[PDB]
Amino acid sequence: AHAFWSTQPVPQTEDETEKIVFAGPMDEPKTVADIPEEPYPIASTFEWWTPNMEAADDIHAIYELLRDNYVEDDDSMFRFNYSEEFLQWALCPPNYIPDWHVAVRRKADKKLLAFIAGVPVTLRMGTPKYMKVKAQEKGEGEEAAKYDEPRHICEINFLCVHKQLREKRLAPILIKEATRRVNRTNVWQAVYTAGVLLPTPYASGQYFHRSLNPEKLVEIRFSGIPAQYQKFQNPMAMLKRNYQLPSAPKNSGLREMKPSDVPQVRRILMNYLDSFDVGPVFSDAEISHYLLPRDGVVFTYVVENDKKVTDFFSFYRIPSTVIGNSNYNLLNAAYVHYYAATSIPLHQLILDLLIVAHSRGFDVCNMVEILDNRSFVEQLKFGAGDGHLRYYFYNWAYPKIKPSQVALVML
C-alpha cells in the first residue's frame, strides 16, 4: 500500500499507534559517521541545488515553483500563493541551517523541479499527561519520563514537485536527501503536517473559518449561503449583516508589539504553552523572529494597560490564487498564530484579532482546532470546513493525543 512509507521509521498503522505508551525513538541509534557523506543518488539529467533563502533571487525562484505547483483544492479553485517575504521569514529563523533547504533542478537548463525545507525547532515531545498517569499506575514512571527534556529537532514544510513531474517517485528521493542532511547534523527526529492521511498521525484537527468579506467568499465559491438564508427577501444582505464586525478594536490598551515586549510576551506564552502535551520552546531571539510585526507577513498585538503587557495575539497572512473567477485574482487569508490571555477571556482577545484582520482587508480568518481554539468558535461565528490538518513525527513513537493537546502552529 505504501512503497515508500513502509520503509521509513514511522508507525505503520492506527493499531500500532494504539499500542504506544511512551515517547521515544523508532530506529536504532546511529552516529553522524554512519550517515553517507555523498548526496543521495539522482538521475543524470537532474541535480541537487541548495537555494540561499536570504537572497532575493533564490527566494523568488522558490516562490514561483510554489505559486504554480503547491497545494490546491480538489476542484482546482484555489492554490496557495505564499509571498516571498513570508518564505524568507518561515525558512530563516534563528540558527537555521542553510543545507536543510533542498531543491532539484534539471541540469541542462536549470529548470526548477522540486523543493523541500527543514528548519530547527525546540519541541516538548515527551510522554503526554494521560499516558504518564497510566505509567504511574503501572510502576513505569522512569521509562515514561526518559524523553521529557525539550528536543532540538527538524520541522519539515513546503514539499513540492512540479506538476509535469508528478507520480514519478521524486518526492521519496527529496525526503531521503533531506533526512540525510538533517542526520549529518546529528538530528534524528522531525515534525510535519499534511492534509492527506499518511502512516500515521499522532493528532488530527479540523480546519475552521470565520468569514470577514462574505460577499467575496460567496462570489469565489469559498463559501456557499446556508439554505436557511433563502427564507429571506435579501439572502446576501442578511449574510453580510451576520458577519459584520466593529471598525476599531474594543480592548483598552491594544497596540502593536514592539521589541521591548519580547521578555513579557515570552513569559506569558511559555507559561500558557507549557499546559499542552506537544509544544515549542522559544528563546528571546525566536520570540522576536516569529512574533514581531513584519509587513505583509505577521501581525502581533499586545494588551497593555497601566504599563503592563497582560495578553497578546498574532496572525499571519497566506494569500491564495483564485484560479477560475473573473472578478478576483486573490483570496487574502489571515491565520490564527500564537496568543496568550491572562486578563480577559480568550473570546474577547480574539474578537480584536478578527476586527484588525477585517480592517486590514483580509477576506477570511482560518485556524486548526489546536491550542484553546475551540473555546471561541461559536461566539465568534467560526464554522468547521471540509479540511483537516494531521500532525506527524519522523522516527518518534508517540501516543495518540487530542488536537487540543497540541500547541505547535504549522505554517
Point out the annotated binding site for tetradecanoyl-CoA.
2-5, 159, 161, 166-167, 169-171
Site string for ligand MYA, 1-20 (x = CB under 6 A): -xxxx---------------
Among 20, 91, 102, 159, binds ligand MYA (CB under 6 A): 159
- Closer to ligand MYA by CB, 73 or 219: give it: 73
Q: Does 194 help bind ligand MYA (rule: CB under 6 A)?
A: yes
Helix axis angle, 56-69 to 84-91, nearest 10°: 110
Q: Does 385 help bind ligand HWQ (rule: CB under 6 A)?
A: yes
- Which region holds residue 322: left if phi is over 0, alpha if psi is between -120 and 50, else beta? beta
* 87 a catalytic residue: no
Residues 6 or more apart whose Cβ sits within 8 Å of residue 354 = 210, 212, 245, 365, 380
How far is 336 from 341, CA to CA, in rounded Å?
Answer: 14
**191 φ, ψ (degrees, to nearest 5):** -120, 145
**From ligand MYA, Mg ion, ligand HWQ, none, interface partner of 389 (C-beta below 5 to 8 A by class):** ligand HWQ
Write the CA distances from 217 to 98, 223, 233, 380, integer angstroms.
38, 5, 20, 18
Site string for ligand HWQ, 330-369 (x = CB under 6 A): -x-x------------------------------x-x---
List the grid coordinates of 112.
526548477
Alpha helices in 146-259 (DSSP H): 170-183, 214-219, 235-242
Among 166, 241, 250, 258, binds ligand MYA (CB under 6 A): 166
Q: Which helix (H) or strand (E) holds 68?
A: helix 56-69
Q: Does 33 help bind ligand MYA (rule: CB under 6 A)?
A: no
The 3-state DSSP class for residue 238 equals: helix
CB of 223 to ligand HWQ, least distance (A): 8
- Closer to ligand HWQ by CB, 288 or 366: give it: 366
Confirm if 303 and 251 have CB atoms less than 8 A apart: yes
Annotated binding site for CoA, which residues? Answer: 2, 4-5, 161, 167, 169, 171, 193
Q: Does 182 help bind ligand MYA (rule: CB under 6 A)?
A: yes
CB of 395 to ligand HWQ, least distance (A): 20
CB of 363 to ligand HWQ, least distance (A): 8
- The residue assigned the cell 521529557 is 148
Q: Which helix (H) or strand (E) holds 311?
A: strand 308-322
Q: Does 79 help bind ligand HWQ (rule: CB under 6 A)?
A: yes
Q: Which residues are catalytic?
A: 411
Residues at the site binding ligand MYA, with contacts judged by CB under 6 A? 2-5, 69-71, 154, 156-161, 166-172, 175, 178-179, 182-183, 187-190, 192, 194, 196, 198, 394-395
